Nucleic acid binder design. Structure first.
Lengths: 57, 56
DNA sequence: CGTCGATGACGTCATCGACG
DNA sequence: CGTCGATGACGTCATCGACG
């Protein structure tokens, strides 16, 4: 029945808008975490140039 | 006139959806680039461990 | 071939801060 | 107070591939 088809679709649309919402938050969360990782790797590098300056003489 | 308000809001919705799309594309591209940088810095570190090894 | 759930695309409403 | 553009939340349509 048509009437009921649309009814189910209204629900489908609601979950769909919801997954997209989660997907976007996942993305922003990935960006935030990749940034912290960068900083860590960047500092670790200097922590290593440090050790390379000590062994330097 | 109520009619016209709705015509305009129709256009406005097209822009809005368009910008949300562009915004999501940005997030996706950022994830991609941050991953690349991540790699560079990771291997660079090992390059420096290599260089810290050469000092023994 | 008829149906299902997922999705992209779209128009509409409700609501917001800003403007005068 | 009316109005404006932007935008979040919806419901609807068209279309998909999968199923039987």
């Amino acid at each position: 029945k048509a009437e009921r088809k649309r009814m189910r679709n209204r629900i489908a649309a609601s979950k769909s808008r919801k997954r997209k919402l989660e997907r976007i938050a996942r993305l922003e969360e990935k960006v935030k975490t990749l940034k912290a990782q960068n900083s860590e790797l960047a500092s670790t590098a200097n922590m290593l140039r440090e050790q390379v300056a000590q062994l330097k003489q």
